[model samples]
Target chain A: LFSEFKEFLYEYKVIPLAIAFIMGIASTALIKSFVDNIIMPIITPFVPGGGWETATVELGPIVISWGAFLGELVNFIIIAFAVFIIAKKVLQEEKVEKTKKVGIVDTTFARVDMASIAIKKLKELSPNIKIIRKTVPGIKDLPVACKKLLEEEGCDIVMALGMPGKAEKDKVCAHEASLGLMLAQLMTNKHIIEVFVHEDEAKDDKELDWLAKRRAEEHAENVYYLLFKPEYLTRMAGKGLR
Target chain B: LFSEFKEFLYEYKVIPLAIAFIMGIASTALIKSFVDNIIMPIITPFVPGGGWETATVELGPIVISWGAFLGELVNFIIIAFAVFIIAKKVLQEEKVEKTKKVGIVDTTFARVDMASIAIKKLKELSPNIKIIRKTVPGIKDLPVACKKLLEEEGCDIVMALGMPGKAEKDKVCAHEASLGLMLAQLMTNKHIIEVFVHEDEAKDDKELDWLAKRRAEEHAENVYYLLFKPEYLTRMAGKGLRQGFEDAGP
Candidate 1:
């Protein structure tokens, strides 16, 4: 029963992402302890209108609660930074093995060509990064191929890239590849970066091309950082490359 | 310069992967010889096409490559057993250390930043390969750094990443780092992988960086075999990388 439930929970990273969402909300509340107990003690007295929770400005008949927005904004930054720092600290230990030989799993069904772009770009960053290319026919096969590349081929990190079909479904293939590789990672104690572009979302050829290339290369850049410069990945989102 | 280049190869697994690549092929061929002499005969007669070499089934316009697939399938089972024997008898020695402290000593002025690169790689490889980075001014300073990391930082194992300077002082510093780390090894009764990328070792800055990252990552993989015993993935002292350690590395 536990195994069955786990399979259900892990079908598409439902448990992991669900837990993350709950913990995200929980953390927001947890930070209230800091803002309320520490920062607010010193700053609360200066609440111009006697309450810092809802400090507002009256513009004509409209009241804008600028103070609450301010608190929310500070909480958000703290949360994001906390996330980055957490990742950084976990990765700082030489305990985990980083990138050596990267496995690139791309399917031919992908609308836009990915291998060409990723290899072209990665060549400039880390030449040590050898691209062990594995091409399969479908997204479903990407996960097992991912396991082979990691367990047998001895790739340090595997990057599985594929473009989805017009199934217009809940990205079943995309979800499978992600969760399958996640299971692969936990089993091998290795890292696998999965990048996928959906068809319905990216409608036309031009957008699919743009989206696939962007996600693929961003992962290519990320593969190097995952192996060498993980410290920079904290703000990797802000870099706007993805 | 040739000696320096040789050191470069020895430091990085350039020579090992090349050997693994070569031995991997050589073994595949040797295995094929056995398959051809023994396994193929029994299976091929079952093939409708008669002989094993280019056995095929012509269905209308298209051809079906059944014989080769059949042979490959047989070999696939053999390969799994081959890997099973290798893994069970070889890789399962080192018990995976869980949630342990690891010390890493590196040099700032070195051409390659070993600690950062290794730390990045290790994080990808294992959850327990925690690296506490300690950067010192010179390669000679790495010994005390390693000792401190083990004794003071409470690291399970300390890896020293050093790039000794060129010349007489350089050899002394490099030797110091190696010997010091080795001494610390005994004092702690633990291992310290002294991974180094020497100055004036590679052809250019780009080559140095490439060598640095590659060497560091390989060493990070080696941590697994050292701590987990041995595996088909990565190893040290010419043990396990690609095929198996006994014959893969130079």
Candidate 2:
């Protein structure tokens, strides 16, 4: 019987309600004091009347107390501004625990290293950015790696990097991987930066290797600048730039 | 004590393990019968031995009995090849339980009426492609609708199609929305085929209206081809393609 009574009190929120009632009364009185004692005393001089707390507008026996409303309005505006400022500053300062997890799904078979470079640039831009590396077994496994990477909430974004071989089969697999990545993008509502260094995107192996590294590094810069200034980073995508 | 025994059996999978072992022995016997009876009878003739039931090659007593291996290998290969063929055919055909779900995140605030056209094209391609529409409230809310559409498994892919306004702010939002879609593509590890006809993409009002309809319908074709043939459909996303090809068909 006693426990049920206590449960009833809790379920009805009687305790919190009583406590809130006391706190509300005290807070209301305190705010009124803050307004009338300090704020209104200074603003009262600028007010039309010598006194601001009970100041009123009289027009043919119609009185309006806009001054007291100003005190309450200013009080609320001040609090609202603080909340807005605090929310933004607090989120920006990283006072809360959060790290920007970037998924790096790349092929380890090829020496086309840019995941690290891109991750490094991202880290330099913001210490919050964390790289989650998921390596593909080969060029053909790009889609599989991408699927596995994006399926989970381990990363906020994914960058799939690979170097396809100089063959039709490689291109076929690349094409298939593109389809898989496309599906993955829809599977998850996020972005995937498809970075490729095809063995035949360049004229010769010399240019290919240079293009691989340069393109990877450029993509890294693109990643850094993309997160920084998306307005400028659209050039990196250039989907409909024309 | 009785309940605890049930828990123990479940925790250790003792029941399932016992069933597996019995099934394993039965399956092994069945497979051996199949290999020796259905398969080896025909293959034994080409085994270079009088009877492939026990064929061998003796290189000075270093016997190589590769006959039984073929029976087993052939048995496994046939099953594996059948599986490969079935999986491929099943994917291409609409025989499976469910088809691929394609999300159509669109807006109808403007005259950019391509959602139904694209959905129509997708359905025409195959019954395997199911359209899940995600509509935006306005041009500016494109990104929000896209993000929401992509976040949940509401659909498989998001084709963000919209029309921007004459204002620069709309352009700014259009750029931001494109960036957001790109990021969403990466974040989800999927491709969101973004289709947009900016007010600036055209020369005048009439051209703009025609371009809006044409661009959207063409994108619907892109969506159709992207599903039908990734190789050939890559052409749709390609630039500088002549208008004659698009006008050649509906």
Candidate 3:
């Protein structure tokens, strides 16, 4: 029993509790004296009767001391509100720190690395095609820029490569196809330029497969490349020695 | 943009979060209605001007609306306290159910089965010595009872045999030692009976090895039994039996 009691005291930090309890008792006495002697006497003139002690209503044999209840109630409300605001500020500070750690810049960099590797492989196969690099808000923004470039440049073929963040495969593919359709719509009159939207550059194989299957059903002539290389493109352009 | 947005929504459980958001809004509205319609009217008569609107003291451009603030503050306090009580009640209910499942009756039965098995194996080696059966509040309680019987009967040897509950092993051992000391103090005059408290009956070979070593130093002649039959005792005592008693009863 003595050991058990000792364990309980140690687990509960009883020394700290005892110190707080003693301090609380001392503070309560001091606060009570301050309120009763200094504050209550000064405020008695403004209050009806002789403050809390005299402020009472007779209801049969029972007397309702509204003044005392009102004073304590106000004090309780002030203390509670102060505590709530402090707790809210502390919690909010911690939440903001957690949010910053899981931000989008890290995810975007990972996706770009994956896409760059895929595009490098694709360039090896199609050595004749020249690949130009451009950055937009996301993969969905690729089609808008592709359409504008095709119309203005009057190119024979345009391959728009978009890098999407590390996300689900189906979503990455859908965004790729959505960008392709937007470009296809803008360049509808000019059938000379074949607009190929490469979504695999941004996403993994699973996502690319899903997007490819979805795109095949939508466009019969839509050719999906497994790999591309920038060195092969530079060789095709005849502007660099590999 | 769309794909990133989709990932964000799915990962964050945005749909459930939106529902929680709406529910929070609704809760605030409900609280506001409660404060405005019910509480404010009741509190209006108690104030100096018969209402909160008139009780305000305007100070410069920043009107000190202490009355409105006080009323809202009271509502906040009431809501916070009510939520705290509700959460506490829910957690307490779960704890109560868990404690009930692992109650004393179940604990005692498990320990007795283990103790009986150990004792039966001890009886196999020492066939000359007859072992008695008994159960008290627990294995801990057995020591005190054994000591009393030894003092009264002036027995040659008394052994408190029982299994200790896994959770209450330390507690049971301490109680057993306390009873043993009490018995030794009482029997100082005659010194006729040898009192032995055995908690090893509650433990197996692997569990008992450490305890057995400790007991070797304490007891005059410590005997560690390896195995025994639990089924035999279960049959005699009845199935799910939590307590029992036998003192070579005639």
Q: In terms of lDDT, which candidate is strongest?
A: 1
lDDT per residue (tens digit) for residues A169-232 in model 2: 8767766665566556555645566676667778886787778777666656544543445444
Across B1-250, the per-residue lDDT of candidate 1 in tens digits comes to: 6687555443442443343333343335345544543466555555433356567879899998876787777777777787678778665566654576777766544655666667877777776566677554445446655666677687887777767665653564466446656656776787888787775677787887787677777787677566656554333445534422234534
Comparison by TM-score, 1 against 3, better one: 1
Q: Per-residue alpha-carbon lDDT of model 1 for A1-242, expressed as tens digits?
A: 67988888767645544444444445556765686556654666778543666565544433444555455445555655665665575455434655578788888877778888888778778876677888999888888898899888879777787776777463655554555655565455455666667776676889878878986787787667656775553323112120
TM-score of each: 0.32, 0.35, 0.22
Which ten residues in a row are the worst by lDDT in model 2 chain A? A233-242
- The candidate 1 chain A region of ten consecutive residues with least summed lDDT is A233-242
User: Compared with the real two-chain complex, what DockQ does model 2 have?
Assistant: 0.01
Clashes of 2: 17
Ordered by TM-score, highest first, the candidates read: 2, 1, 3
DockQ of 3: 0.01
Off by over 4 Å in 3: A1-122, A127-242, B1-12, B47-50, B57-63, B93-250
Per-model clash counts, in order, read 21, 17, 14
Native-to-model Cα distance after best TM-score fit, residue B19 in candidate 3, in Å? 1.5
lDDT of 3 by residue, B1-250 (tens): 2344444456556568668657777877787778866787687876754377546777787768777787788889877877789789998886652210000111243222334333444454455444443456544565455555445543334444433434466655756555564555465432212222245443475645444333322221223211124345545453343222322321
For model 3 the local lDDT of residue B198 reads 44
